[PDB]
Write a protein that binds this ligand. Sequence first.
Ligand SMILES: O=c1ccn([C@@H]2O[C@H](COP(=O)(O)OP(=O)(O)O)[C@@H](O)[C@H]2O)c(=O)[nH]1
Length: 369
Amino acid sequence: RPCYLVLSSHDFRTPRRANIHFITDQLALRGTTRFFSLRYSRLSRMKGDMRLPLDDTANTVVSHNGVDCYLWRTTVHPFNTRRSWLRPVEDAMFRWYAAHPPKQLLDWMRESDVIVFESGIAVAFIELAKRVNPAAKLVYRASAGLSTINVASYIEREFDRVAPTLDVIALVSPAMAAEVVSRDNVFHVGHGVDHNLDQLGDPSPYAEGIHAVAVGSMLFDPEFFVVASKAFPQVTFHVIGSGMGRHPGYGDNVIVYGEMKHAQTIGYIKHARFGIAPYASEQVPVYLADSSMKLLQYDFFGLPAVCPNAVVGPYKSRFGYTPGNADSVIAAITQALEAPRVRYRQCLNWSDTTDRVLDPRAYPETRLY
Ligand SMILES: O=c1ccn([C@@H]2O[C@H](COP(=O)(O)OP(=O)(O)O)[C@@H](O)[C@H]2O)c(=O)[nH]1
């Protein structure tokens, strides 16, 4: 039993699990498992961080589902000011941040056999991990491209600097490789799915009729549903965890649900006629076609999908539209309604995914070079 440390600006305790949470669940099955949460400060708090409900636990270890969680709270955290004249202040703050890890981080690094750094702020601690524990296998999990996150220049330069020294760079999408300045240690590992997705998919939340589903708040475009619901009165749109309420534009054929536990979303997904990834913008990375979690979930079931053209990507059963263009929304839906359900996409479970995250060389198909 190996001991894992995950560094991320997620916190493991926050209710909507992201990819790193699912991986972390798998790590917790394999060995000790600590999740150290970064980029959280007093500043964070006065800006609406998802982690604020955890604030009274800050800087202490809390056990959550077999994971040791630590939300690091500093007074300020370094960030992209987005003003290129403020750069040397940024560099200063990132250097300062990186130079002042808490003892708990250092201890956890020392205790770890494997340290996973999620793309983002965690980059600032890769070198530190190498110094603290050169025996630790250093796994960078690229949930997102650095440029997409729009990290400070410091983090890009630092990532570029340290990236070759990482044991594993596990890209969610090969499309991320262009901006990763390393080769021999760069691997492709999607997105897992729950090993029991098919069992979770039964029963059925839906009565008779045609049901379409959207799950998730990422770039949530209510206007999609404004148009789609009006244009398709015979379709019931199930809008789950959109991060917002009932937009006044929604037709009565839209059902708006609060955030739903992942396992419970699945029946809504499996038994839908088609799913929707209503990203409000096409100013999105090319990799989002691969990295979108909801689209992966639809894909698992072969659920035809309506999504912006920019995230259709190299996939069947995705019908692109232009956000804000009613005609294209209607055309895409019209096609989705008639698309057959076929499981085109191979979806490894989270356990098999985590295996390849940790030892991609044992699975040579993951190699990008
Ligand atoms: O109330 C919710 C909202 C989101 N999700 C899931 O959370 C993941 C991420 O959703 P988000 O929109 O934030 O990102 P995306 O899927 O579009 O990448 C997706 O698999 C959703 O299916 C969920 O289970 N319940």
